[PDB]
Symmetry: C8
């Protein structure tokens, strides 16, 4: 994972330099190499039981995504966002498996950041994918909160729902906005339930 | 119940894989097998006096329902929601029988989640069924609260009424909305009564 | 009263099964048998000085009423609501006779529940009867509060007035709404008087 | 007074039964007999120095008035309200004579209840008479408060003024409403004066 | 003063009886006799240094004024209000002479009550006279407050200004309203000054 | 100063009697004699170092001004207001010379009272003169506050600015209103500065 | 500096007398002599290291400016305001050199007072110069606050920004208003930074 | 760095004098010399590991930028702002490298000040560059806050986001405004996460 991480970082540097200079071939090549290396690192994380590696792969994926938006190359941006959301899902899975809150919060932040990058570039499709992943992460976040105490997870989940709603508000995807509003309502109910259970 | 639970879980995995790959025959087959197994597990729960089994069958039913909405296959979604509401009713029954609050709260959450899935898919019929079941659960929730103390049940019941109202607001079923508003009023009254009684 | 109560309960079960299956003859027959048995039980309560029997007869009557609304058979629903309001009046009478607050609160809740069932079915006539009975119960509630202390009865009475007003608001019976608003005003005055007297 | 009270109560029972059955001759006869007996009891109260008798005569008069409104027989209702207001005036007189607060508060409540009965039946004339009597009672209430301490009388007086205003608001007698608003202003001033004096 | 007071009281009783029966000659005769006797009593108060006599003469004058409004005889009502305001001025004078707060507050209340009686009868002329006298009393009230401590006089003065403003608001005399608003502003300033001085 | 004060007071009594009777020659004569005597008394105050004499001369001038407004004789009212404002300026001067807060507050009140008298009579010219003098007094008030502590002077100055603004609001002199608003802003700044300095 | 200060004061007295009498030649002559003497005194202050002399020269300049506005002679008013702003700049310089807060606050007040005088006379040009100098003083005020503690400087700076904004609001120079609003925003940020740093 | 700093300061003095006198050749020459010297000083800072040198170079760059806006020479202003933003980026880099909060806050303030200078001059291009750099600094600020404690960094980051939004509001660059609003939402989420993590 260490050599993998360093190679992925150097490829990200290549991609940033190619974006500043204005390359495409090296741009997409280093980008997809970084995503392949990040997926390989995610594989290594589960084969060797390391959660932090998943988070770092997510961060690497996020960096690649941000670069695409500055660059604007959508063809690679979509692949990067798909990778980032998949890594977020894997993070949720391993966190619910182990019972570690911080991983869930990082998953929620990764989902929301993919959403924000979409909102910046203006890609309604990946925006919907991101919002769906974020609401799913809110689900799993409330569930973990119920499982392992940590009341602040409840507040974080409600706030993530509100954030998804407001982001859909600015962008305009009323479908996503309706999903988010209904989810905030039902999550307020579940929140009162879990708070009473634990506290 | 254990082997039953594992078989139902594996059938749910089959259904999820069939939904991602895009199957229908295996999709509906594994789905209805999961519902049949969940109903069998509900039977086993009462024949062997286990409440938690009812909750797990509800969760399994809920998972199947969510999948239908992602999939969109309404013909199975309606059966799944009917099963989920019936399991919620059984949960209310056994909870009022024993005097266990947590079961009632889980029933309310199951009803509201069926409602939210309906709101997502946009099926006004099952939405009305879900809202009615939820208000009934609020009734039984206030009743138990009066029976076994636990004041937080009162707040949960009022909040469930408010949630049903707001969900009907977003969807638009003004009939359900009127039922919910009137129910919130009369429940505020009953709430002041029960709070004075217990506290 | 015990055998009477069990027979009334079994008749209620008959009525529920007939409503689910879709009967009318057995429906109305078991319903009117339940009401006759509940009135007989009310008789037994006074002849043997038992208040709780009155409350249980009220509950049985309420159950029959709810069933009519799900069923929609108005011809029996009106008789059931008339019975329920009469039982509420008897409850008020015996409570003011003995000086027991809880009975008065249960009377208020029974009146409001008859009102809510009317609002559900949409029968303005019985709605007016229910609202009148509820305001009368608020009168007697303030009176008892003055008699036997228990300040919370004051808050309950004001809240019942507000609830009658809001229910008339949703339904639309402006006459009942005006009665309720005027009654809330004069009850706020009486409330300040009684609070100063006792506290 | 005791035999007088019992005879008046039995006549009230006659009147209630005649109202339920639908009589007029016995209705008005028992009603006017009850009012005559209540006035006789008021006479007995002053000739034998008993304040509580005045309050009970007021209550009896109030009961007769309520019955008229349910019945709707205005020709007797006006006489009943005139009697009730006169008894309220006598109560104010004897209370200011002795220096007993509770009697004044009961007078205010009697006046407001006559007003509310008028508002129910819709008789603007007696409504104006009632509002005038109520404002007069507020005057005497502030005066007693200044005389015998008891600060809560001040709050009760201001609240009675506000109640008269709101009742005139619902009914519509803008003249009475203007009287009440001006009276509330000047009573707020007098209230600050009396509070500073006593406290 | 004692025999004078009793004769004035008996003349007031004559006037009340004449108003109920509907007299004019005896009405005006007893009224002007009462006012003459009250002025004689005011004379006696200063010749024998008794402040309370002034207050009682004011009360007697106020009673006569109220009666005129119920009666509506304006020709005597104007004389009564002129007398009452003059007695209020004399009360202010003697209070500032001696340094007794309660007398000033009673003067303010007398002025406001004359104003309220005018507002009832609807005589804009005497209304303006009353408002002017009330603002003058507020002036002298702040002055005394500065002289003899007693901070509550400050709050009473500001409240009297606000009351004059609101009364002019309901009646409509915009000139008086403007005077009152400007006076409230300058009195808030003087109030902050006096509060800082004393406290 | 004593004989001067008594002669000025007697001349003021002459003027009041002449105003009630309706004189002009004696009215203006006693008025201008009172103003001449008050100016002579102001001279005596500085020649013999007595501040209170200045305040009493101001009060005498204020009394003359009030009388003009009741009378309405503008030709003398303008001279009286000019005298009063000049006395206020002299009061500010001697107060800043000695360092005595109360004198400054009395100056502010005198200026505002001249303003209020103008607002009553409706003389926009002297109103502007009064507002200018009042804002100047607010300046000197903040300055003294900075000099001799006494934080309440700060609040008094801000309140005087607000009062000048509101008075200009009612009257309508938008120029004066703009001056006052700007002055309130800059005085809030100076107030935060002085509060931090002292406290 | 002492003889210089006295000569400048006497020239200011000459200018005030010439303004009251209505002179121009002596008016402008004494004015420009006062400004020349104040600049000479500013020179003396730095050559002999005395900050208070700068403040007194500023005050003298401010007095001359005020006089111009009462007089209205713009040709000298502009020179006076230019001098006052330059003295304010010098005050800021020497204060930041030494590290003395009070001098900075006095600079801000001088700038705002020049602004207020401009707003009075209505000279948009010098108004813009004053607002710019005031915002510059706010900059240096935050900087000193960061340098020498004294948190109240932060609040004073924010308040000066708000005051500049409101003054531009009343006058109408939307450009200055936009500068001030943006400056208030960025100063709120810098304020949170400095508060966290020090406190 | 010391001689470099002094030479850069003297060149800044040359530029200020040339701006007041109205030069262009010396203006741009001293300006670009100052920027070259500041970049050389930034080089020296990293080659000799001194963070404060970076901040001083930023301050020097900021001073040059301000001067351009007063001067209005855009051709040099753009280069100055580019330099300032690059220095801000370098400051963020070295701060995240070492783990020193104050440097990050200074970077945010530098970015916002470049933005404010742009808003003053009205150059939408550099305004967008500045807003982007500021949001990037907010990102790195939250990241450091998570890294090295110091909760106040969280509040500073949220406030910087709000400030960028409001600045875009006044100027009008709705694109930048949308970026800022979305960033504030996602930063509120990240803020709740980091606060829960640390505190």
């Amino acid at each position: 994972p260490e050599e993998i991480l360093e190679r992925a970082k150097e490829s990200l540097e290549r991609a940033r330099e190619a974006s500043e200079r204005g390359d495409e071939e090296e741009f997409r090549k280093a980008a997809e190499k970084a995503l392949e290396l990040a997926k390989r690192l995610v594989e290594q994380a589960k084969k060797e039981g390391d959660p932090e590696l998943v988070l770092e792969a997510a961060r690497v994926a996020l960096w690649v995504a941000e670069l695409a938006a500055k660059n604007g190359d959508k063809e690679v941006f979509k692949k990067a966002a798909e990778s980032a959301l998949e890594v977020a899902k894997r993070l949720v899975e391993v966190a619910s498996k182990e019972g570690d809150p911080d991983l869930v919060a990082w998953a929620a932040l990764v989902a929301l950041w993919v959403a924000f990058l979409a909102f910046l570039n203006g890609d309604k499709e990946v925006f919907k994918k991101a919002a769906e992943s974020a609401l799913e992460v809110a689900k799993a976040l409330m569930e973990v909160a119920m499982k392992v105490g940590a009341p602040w997870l409840v507040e974080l989940a409600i706030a993530v729902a509100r954030a998804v709603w407001l982001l859909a508000e600015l962008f305009g995807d009323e479908e996503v906005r309706r999903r988010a509003e209904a989810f905030e309502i039902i999550l307020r109910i579940a929140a009162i339930a879990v708070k009473a259970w634990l506290g």
